[PDB]
Design a protein around this nucleic acid. Structure first.
Ligand SMILES: [Cl-]
Ligand SMILES: [Cl-]
Ligand SMILES: [Cl-]
Ligand SMILES: [Cl-]
Lengths: 234, 236
DNA sequence: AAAGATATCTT
DNA sequence: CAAGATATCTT
């Protein structure tokens, strides 16, 4: 399928190549940074060719946001079926158990057209391509010195998983109100060992999660949410 | 001076090299993206070797943060002058059409500017200068495939070096992340330093007492004129 | 954990 | 403009 082919392609590309620098049209290479702000950017760009390739094999058009405040990184859809779009979002985190910030819980999930390339209800799947790298110069290089360029990571792993499956019940951020993923080992993300019973539960939980502890002290975790449901959503 | 040599070097490198892709150890090239998140990251990496070169030439050591939530991008200091550190911060913004007005988010106004050791590599009072290396690019299929040893994700790029206080404005650059906003002006105004504050001291006092929301600012000061009125009256 | 920093953009 | 979105980290 598109899904199986995409993750097979991502795995192989991750196994075969090591990004190590920024190259200019003149052939001068600048080494990379060892922080997430740098790597998250690189990992997405590294995934782009692969995503377009596989999508094309399966007859899907690939669209990227035209706005910088828009989710997702990639929108896939067949021109015949515009209402069955697939959102593919790249997320990154580091290790020296991990966790990811899975996007806002007050934007598109609460307003059908807020900060999203296409209305939320036009997407039938929301995939996360997660990159996990094990954390590790100030000079430039030429094409013959690629082997000398320090790689900003000791290792990198990649997985493709549905957003709802790896979602947790604790916010991933405060002021930027992000859904927090489960806090687990890489294996749990690949295997989809989450806490939500269904995507319906995931969505409802995050659509009704209060922004601060004061207000939440309703529900602060999955157990309290299930109780809130029993009480009649009050 | 370190400053004159640094801008000349940055300005020159900008003119002689065009960043165009991510290269792998195997020689495979991945095209760049055209958004600010990508380019701001690139422009900093592009600036790094130049900053280090010029700094070393003037006997300055360069130190980058050991963690993501610390300002500045680069801390320069001579061993002999530990309390005369120079913060150099890389900032980027874009323009749809070249020569349009631009604005930058000049860092938070509730971290190190209000607390000497909060979110900063070294205590704020050990720095005597806060420079901003500003990059402005005009925003701009081949970009979708990989290449061997490529369209550029920008039409043109301009760079300037200026003191933070000099290009500071009186309206916030961000809401929930409480950033100082720069003046909203053309590139040349940043180069020439046509800001609104009269001194670095006025800049600091203004941003140290700027309230977080329009509501609060409504009864104190929301702009420079109001701040000067607030000051005239006795800070009340 | 919960809240707010790390940079910049959009309506 | 304001305010809160776009990502992740720190504590
Ligand atoms: Cl993106
Ligand atoms: Cl992303
Ligand atoms: Cl940096
Ligand atoms: Cl920066």
């Amino acid at each position: 399928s598109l899904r199986s082919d995409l993750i097979n392609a991502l795995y192989d590309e991750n196994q075969k190549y090591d990004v190590c620098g920024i190259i200019s049209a003149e052939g001068k290479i600048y080494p990379l940074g060892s922080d997430t702000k740098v790597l998250s950017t690189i990992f997405e760009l590294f995934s782009r060719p692969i995503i377009n390739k596989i999508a094309e094999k399966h007859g899907y058009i690939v669209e990227e946001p035209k706005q910088q405040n828009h989710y997702p990184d990639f929108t896939l859809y067949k021109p015949s079926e515009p209402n069955k779009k697939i959102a593919i979002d790249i997320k990154t985190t580091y290790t020296n158990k991990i966790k990811f910030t899975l996007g806002g819980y007050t934007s598109f999930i609460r307003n059908n057209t807020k900060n999203i390339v296409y209305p939320f209800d036009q997407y039938i799947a929301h995939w996360i391509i997660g990159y996990v790298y094990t954390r590790v110069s100030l000079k430039t290089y030429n094409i013959n010195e690629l082997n000398e360029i320090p790689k900003p990571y000791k290792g990198v792993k990649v997985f493709l998983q549905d957003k709802w499956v790896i979602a947790g019940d604790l916010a991933g951020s405060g002021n930027t109100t992000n859904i927090g993923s489960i806090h687990a080992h890489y294996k749990d993300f690949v295997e989809g060992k989450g806490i939500f019973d269904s995507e319906d539960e995931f969505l409802d939980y995050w659509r009704n999660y209060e922004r601060t502890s004061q207000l939440r002290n309703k529900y602060n975790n999955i157990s309290e949410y299930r109780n809130w449901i029993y009480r009649g959503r009050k």
